[PDB]
Design a protein around this ligand. Structure first.
Ligand SMILES: [Zn+2]
Lengths: 44, 286, 154, 166, 150, 221, 110, 294
């Protein structure tokens, strides 16, 4: 019933790892959308 | 400090009423309270009911086995036979048997179309604890009842009530007692519906069997009326048709509920327990 | 409106604010750990960090000596700044102080903080520690890390 | 003055029968003539009302009001009083059944105003009352749901008769 | 006022009068004083009236108690369990006779507002009105603007 | 105040002593049996004479029967809280011990049987005219079966069982005020042997709190 | 401006007992693992902090006696040494403050 | 043989009967002295009732914080369930998820999550198909998922659960969590356990192995609601401890020739260590990979 935040229970070792992991996923997801016309675009 | 006594006395009376209201005293038998003469009360009981009871039989009807066994225990505890007191068991059995046969005759004669199961359920309701206890309490039977425990247990009160009927049967005979049962038990059906007293399940199943006994085609359910079908407050009238002839119609908030009610309506008509049936005749027999 | 106003209004005005902060900073240099209202410690913490940088310039830099002379009201502390505190942080580029909130002050329920210069000789504060790496969540993440490192090398 | 709250810990119930269920223990305690306002104390007695003994002590330990340190002191000595005197097995198996404040006996003083005028200030005092009951805190009542609202509305539509007729 | 007091529906005790009439008054308890001007009218009621009143009502047990009292009272008890106490302080013999007769005729139900001056368990013989009572039926029970056999 | 006002002619009239004049230590292994003998007997005989001095018609043989009656009736007062009658049956030293802990409790006690006849183990008298008062203490040995079921303030069983009899070996000491014309024999105290078996366990679990340490303090083994 | 009419207790209860006026339940309270006393997540444990302060004050009182006057801050580092301990290699050239007690378990020599 | 509903009723009666017997074997209310050896509340002694009072009762003497945070007990150096009756005078410590070394607590929570999966799997399939519980393999927590080996009916030899089906198992698991059922423990002799699990061949073989390991051939039984299983060690107090719980993947173990053992897999976190939505998703992905116990 007590509120929590993302790194509350993370150890010293895991906080940098989690930051890097989520950061890379964001960048990869943004790079995957850079070719809209090769990914079944709607009619122009 | 003000002079006088009247106001102080009046306030004391009020303080005692509130104290009693805050802590209502545990109830006690009327006999234990002041202004009680058992012999006088017994005689008034018969006179109120316009019945010529035999005072010896009537007194025994009130005596219960529990009161006799407890009275003897108190005698043993005090180191004190003269307690050859006859219980109401024999009178109770006689009265119970007469009432069931007498009520069965009243109900069979009036409603010849009800099967035996229905009449039995009606007699069980009329002679049941709840109905009998209500009548007994409102006829001063509980005040005159000699019991070990107060308030009188419902089973004990029911036994005493039928013992009084047994006393009347010996004193006045079957015809006089039959009027007593008519005037205090049959009247308890006033306003009651058939299926309020006779608790049944699957009315449609019962209806189909009855129509088979009567060599009538099975009833076909049809929607006579409908309103608010798609809303949270629908109304449905389901009609039961035998050979494309309407036998009964019932309302409901769902088609299933409406159909079950229509079956109950058909059963009430078949058995002669319609709301608008001829009222019970309480007039003096000719 | 106070958009971008980085300094607090303290004491009896601008001068008194500096004097109030200076007394706090002087106490910190002597004792190396003090407790004071949270807001005031937060305000003073910036000056306590910069004072060390001036101390690192050395006692021969006349500007540094003038800065230390103003901010340290007890002159015996000026040698300590240049010869004790600044050499202690020779190998750091910042983060000389640690500030932690302590239970509210009893009298007026003021929010309170403890501030100290790192590396002092005093009994260590009960610092907050992150959960052990051996906890259930941390072990599940260690497995995920091990797995991701193995797949990259392949 | 009335001191009925202290006499409620002297009620001796008759021994229970073998079939009867375990009766929870009730512990009454209070503190008189507290130099504090009953209106300000009411907000603290309302806070822990219904809480467990250990939850109430945690909420009062980090409250900044002056009454908090007093109620917590009254709870700590009522907890010990329960296990020591009222035959309570576990000291944590207690919850706040009743907790309210009351007006105490107050003193009147002069408050000087300008132009030779004055007011009368009351030096306020209050009482604090608490009742502890053995067992876990009763589960909070769930909020009324749509099924209950509809079930109640339809029940009112079914209870309506034809008025002012036969 | 009605809003400031309770109410009840008109009713009877055990359907009284349907099969037979049973007097609901069951007991009367008088408390007169041998000496005392307040009970003068109550003493004269016990000398000539109470005996003739009991002959007519054999189902009511009357308990006359002569004892020192400043306010003489009659306590009436009914079969349904109701108890009613009425002071006869300083009342004349005729006044007491009227009061005692009224008690004999009452059922014992609470003397409070009666919502309706009538009661019935069978208000309808022909069927209680409902919205379809006077509505005609249509072929195949079709609703307004409903396409059949589409 | 410990002592009433000073320089007052009136003083407190005490009817009892606080302790046993010469505590009777029962021989070890007496539960099994369930020159010095003469020396103790002679001291008892001496003391018995000063008991028979003030009250001529005293019989040691009758006392153990009387002692049992006093004991049973005193304990029966606890069941109904008949304190007024209890003061006649027990001394002021005994009364607080018996009743203080049961003020808000229900005690159901009963006497079942006496396994062994009661034996006057020791009879002794106080030093003459302590304050003008002479007391006589008669220790008695009782081996009897009793049933005890104490309840708490809420009627919940707290100790013992209400139907199971258990054996009790207890040496009850009685005391009388011989000088007082209205002195009587009254339960004074109970001697608890060190070897006595431990009492039956209580129903509820208990926690014994450890040392409450201030922040400066540290815990030591 | 003065009140035109007395405010009823009904109105006053609505104002006084509005959820905005009530004390809010705190969800950030936890047990201190070191001492077992309660603490808030973002605030130091009061029990542990007081313990540290009490030892800090004793050391400061000893520092006072060694300095023996105002304006006598040393120009060298300081070490606290407890009964049964001797200066380490890295404690040479530092003012030694000696405490007449055993090293607290939570005070790790560094 | 017995129907599934009847089999549970039989096993529960045997379990209850054995529980009642062990309770009778205590003379009235004997007392034991349990000394607290934890870092906090040092020196507290609990005078408890032998064979009735559990570690949870000792926590109740201290405070509610102990009851909420204490997941396992250390009784004379041995991990001890919070609801397991204490049998002797001993020393007691309380273990939480957030201890510096919570290895034992992790295993206890790790084993209980597997036992909750077994309960849902046994009660999920239609009565047509036969589910045979095998064992809960002991896999390290770092593996990323807990697993439970099951053998399904021959009819379901080409069936692999769908995503909606995996979600259905998860919803049943969460219903078990919502019920907040205590983990009841019973240490019985091999004979008693063999009678309860006579109908199941795998349990009999498993029961025999555990009895052989211990000189006294006493096997540890646990029950949640009406589901009884054999365990490797102490379990957590209640099912409400679990907060995030999902059945992730079902793998078919090899070799498949003798019998097709299906390894059901899940991952869960307690209330005390609940993870953020984003982090939880990453754990679910690794949980879906097959774990090979070493
Ligand atoms: Zn701490």
């Amino acid at each position: 019933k007590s509120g929590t935040w993302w790194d509350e229970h993370l150890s010293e070792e895991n906080v940098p790892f989690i930051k890097q992991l989520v950061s890379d996923e964001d960048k990869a997801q943004l790079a995957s959308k850079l070719c809209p016309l090769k990914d079944e675009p709607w009619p122009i | 400090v003000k002079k006088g006594f009247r106001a102080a006395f009046r306030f004391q009376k009020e303080l005692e009423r509130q104290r009693l209201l805050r802590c209502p005293p545990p109830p006690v038998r009327r006999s234990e309270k002041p202004n009680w003469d058992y012999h006088a009360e017994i005689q008034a009981f018969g006179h109120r009911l316009q019945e010529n009871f035999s005072l010896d039989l009537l007194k025994t009807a009130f005596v219960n086995s529990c009161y006799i066994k407890s009275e003897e225990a108190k005698r043993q505890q005090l180191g004190i036979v003269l307690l050859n007191l006859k219980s109401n068991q024999e009178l109770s059995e006689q009265g119970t048997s007469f009432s069931q046969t007498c009520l069965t005759q009243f109900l069979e004669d009036e409603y010849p179309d009800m099967p035996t199961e229905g009449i039995k359920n009606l007699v069980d309701f009329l002679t049941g604890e709840e109905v009998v206890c209500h009548v007994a309490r409102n006829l001063a039977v509980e005040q005159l009842t000699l019991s070990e425990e107060f308030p009188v247990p419902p089973a004990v009160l029911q036994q005493t009530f039928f013992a009084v009927i047994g006393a009347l049967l010996q004193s006045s005979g079957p015809e006089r007692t039959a009027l007593f049962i008519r005037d205090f038990l049959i009247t308890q059906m006033t306003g009651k519906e058939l299926f309020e007293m006779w608790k049944i399940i699957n009315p449609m199943g019962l209806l189909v069997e009855e129509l088979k006994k009567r060599n009538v085609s099975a009833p076909e359910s049809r929607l006579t009326r409908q309103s608010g079908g798609t809303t949270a407050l629908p109304l449905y009238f389901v009609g039961l048709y035998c050979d494309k002839k309407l036998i009964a119609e019932g309302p409901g908030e769902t088609v299933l509920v409406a159909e079950e009610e229509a079956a109950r309506v058909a059963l009430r008509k078949l058995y002669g327990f319609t709301e608008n049936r001829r009222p019970w005749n309480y007039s003096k027999p000719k | 409106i106070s958009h971008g106003r980085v300094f607090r209004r303290m004491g009896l005005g601008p001068e008194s604010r500096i004097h109030l902060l200076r007394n706090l900073l002087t106490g910190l240099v002597r004792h190396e750990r003090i407790e004071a209202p949270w807001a005031r410690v937060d305000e003073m913490r910036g000056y306590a960090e910069k004072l060390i940088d001036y101390g690192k310039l050395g006692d021969t830099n006349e500007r540094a000596m003038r800065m230390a002379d103003f901010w340290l009201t007890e002159k015996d502390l000026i040698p300590k700044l240049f010869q004790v505190l600044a050499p202690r942080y020779k190998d750091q580029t910042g983060g000389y102080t640690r500030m932690l909130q302590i239970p509210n002050r009893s009298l007026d329920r003021a929010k309170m903080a403890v501030i100290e210069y790192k590396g002092n000789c005093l009994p260590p504060l009960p610092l907050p520690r992150r959960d052990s790496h051996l906890t259930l969540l941390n072990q599940l993440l260690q497995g995920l890390r091990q797995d991701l490192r193995q797949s990259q090398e392949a | 003055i009335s001191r009925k709250w202290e006499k409620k810990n002297k009620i001796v119930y008759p021994p229970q029968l073998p079939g009867e269920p375990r009766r929870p223990a009730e512990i009454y305690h209070c503190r008189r003539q507290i130099k504090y306002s009953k209106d300000k104390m009411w907000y603290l007695a309302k806070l822990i009302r219904g809480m467990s003994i250990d939850q109430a002590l945690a909420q009062l330990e980090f409250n900044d009001k002056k009454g908090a340190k007093i109620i917590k002191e009254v709870l700590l000595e009522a907890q010990d009083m329960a296990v020591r005197d009222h035959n309570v097995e576990f000291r944590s198996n207690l919850y706040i059944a009743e907790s309210t404040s009351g007006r105490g006996q107050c003193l009147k003083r002069i408050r000087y105003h300008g132009r030779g005028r004055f007011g009368i200030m009351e030096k306020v005092y209050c009482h604090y009352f608490v009742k502890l009951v053995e067992g876990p805190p009763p589960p909070p009542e769930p909020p009324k749901t749509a099924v209950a609202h509809a079930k109640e509305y339809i029940q009112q539509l079914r209870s309506r008769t034809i008025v002012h007729t036969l | 006022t009605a809003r400031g007091t309770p109410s009840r529906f008109l009713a009877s005790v055990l359907h009284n009068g349907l099969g037979r009439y049973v007097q609901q008054l069951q007991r009367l308890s008088f408390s007169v004083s041998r000496d005392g001007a307040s009970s003068r009218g109550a003493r004269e009621f016990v000398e000539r009236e109470v005996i003739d009143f009991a002959r007519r009502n054999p189902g009511v047990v009357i308990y006359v108690n002569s004892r020192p009292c400043c306010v003489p009272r009659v306590v009436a008890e009914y079969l349904n369990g109701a108890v009613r106490e009425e002071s006869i302080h300083c009342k004349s013999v005729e006044e007491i006779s009227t009061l005692v007769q009224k008690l004999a005729d009452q059922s014992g139900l609470d003397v409070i507002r009666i919502r309706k001056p009538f009661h019935t368990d069978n208000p309808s013989i022909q069927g209680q009105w409902h919205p379809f009572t006077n509505k005609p039926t249509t072929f195949r029970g079709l609703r307004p603007r409903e396409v059949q056999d589409p | 105040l410990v002592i009433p006002p000073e320089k007052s002619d009136r003083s407190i009239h005490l009817a009892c002593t606080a302790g046993i004049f010469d505590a009777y230590v029962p021989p070890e292994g007496d539960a099994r049996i369930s020159t010095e003998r003469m020396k103790k007997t002679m001291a008892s005989q001496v003391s018995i004479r000063r008991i028979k001095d003030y009250d001529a018609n005293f019989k040691i043989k009758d006392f153990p029967e009387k002692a049992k009656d006093i004991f049973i009736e005193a304990h029966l007062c606890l069941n109904n809280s008949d304190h007024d009658r209890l003061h006649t049956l027990v001394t002021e030293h005994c009364f607080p011990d018996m009743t203080w802990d049961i003020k808000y409790k229900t005690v159901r006690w009963s006497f079942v049987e006496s396994l062994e006849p009661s034996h006057v183990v020791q009879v002794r008298c106080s030093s003459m005219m302590n304050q003008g008062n002479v007391y006589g203490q008669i220790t008695v040995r009782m081996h009897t079966r009793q049933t005890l079921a104490i309840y708490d303030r809420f009627g919940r069983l707290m100790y013992g069982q209400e139907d199971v009899p258990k054996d009790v070996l207890e040496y009850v000491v009685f005391e009388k005020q011989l000088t007082n014309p209205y002195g009587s024999w009254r339960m004074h105290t109970k001697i608890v042997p060190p070897w006595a078996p431990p009492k039956q366990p209580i129903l509820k679990t208990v926690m014994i709190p450890g040392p409450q340490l201030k922040p400066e303090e540290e815990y030591e083994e | 401006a003065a009140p035109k009419n007395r405010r009823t207790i009904e109105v006053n209860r609505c104002r006084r007992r509005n959820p905005q006026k009530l004390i809010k339940v705190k969800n950030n309270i936890d047990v201190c693992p070191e001492c077992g006393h309660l603490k808030q997540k973002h605030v130091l444990c009061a029990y542990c902090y007081e313990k540290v302060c009490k030892e800090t004050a004793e050391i400061r009182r000893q520092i006072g006696k060694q300095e023996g006057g105002p304006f006598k801050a040393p120009t060298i580092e300081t070490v606290v040494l407890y009964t049964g301990e001797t200066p380490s290699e890295q404690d040479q050239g530092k003012r030694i403050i000696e405490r007449d007690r055993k090293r607290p378990s939570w005070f790790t020599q560094n | 043989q017995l129907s599934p509903t009847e089999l549970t009723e039989m096993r529960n009666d045997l379990f209850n009967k054995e529980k009642a017997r062990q309770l009778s074997l205590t003379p009235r209310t004997e007392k034991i002295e349990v000394k607290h050896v934890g870092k906090t509340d040092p020196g507290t002694v609990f005078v408890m009732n032998k064979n009735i009072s559990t570690p949870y009762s000792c926590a109740m003497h201290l405070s509610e914080w102990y009851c909420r945070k204490s997941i396992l007990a250390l009784v004379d150096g041995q991990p001890w369930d919070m609801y397991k009756p204490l049998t002797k005078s001993c020393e007691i410590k309380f273990l939480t998820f957030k201890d510096c070394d919570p290895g034992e607590v992790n295993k206890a929570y790790w084993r209980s999550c597997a036992m909750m999966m077994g309960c849902v799997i046994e009660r999920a399939f239609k009565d047509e198909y036969m589910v045979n519980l095998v064992r809960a393999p002991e896999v390290p927590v770092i593996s990323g998922a807990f697993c439970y080996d099951v053998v399904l009916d021959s009819k379901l030899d080409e069936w692999m659960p769908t995503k909606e089906n995996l979600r259905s198992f998860t919803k049943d698991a969460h219903a078990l969590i919502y019920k907040d059922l205590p983990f009841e423990t019973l240490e019985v002799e091999a004979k008693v356990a063999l009678e309860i699990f006579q109908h199941s061949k795998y349990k009999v073989d498993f029961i025999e192995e555990k009895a052989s390991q211990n000189p006294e051939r006493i096997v540890k039984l646990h029950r949640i609601g009406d589901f009884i299983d054999v365990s490797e060690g102490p379990l957590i107090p209640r099912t409400s401890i679990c907060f995030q719980y999902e059945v992730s993947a079902v793998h078919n173990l090899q070799p498949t020739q003798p019998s097709l053992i299906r390894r059901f897999q899940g991952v869960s976190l307690p209330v005390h260590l609940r993870a953020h939505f984003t982090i939880w998703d990453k754990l679910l992905e690794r949980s879906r990979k097959m774990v090979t116990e070493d």
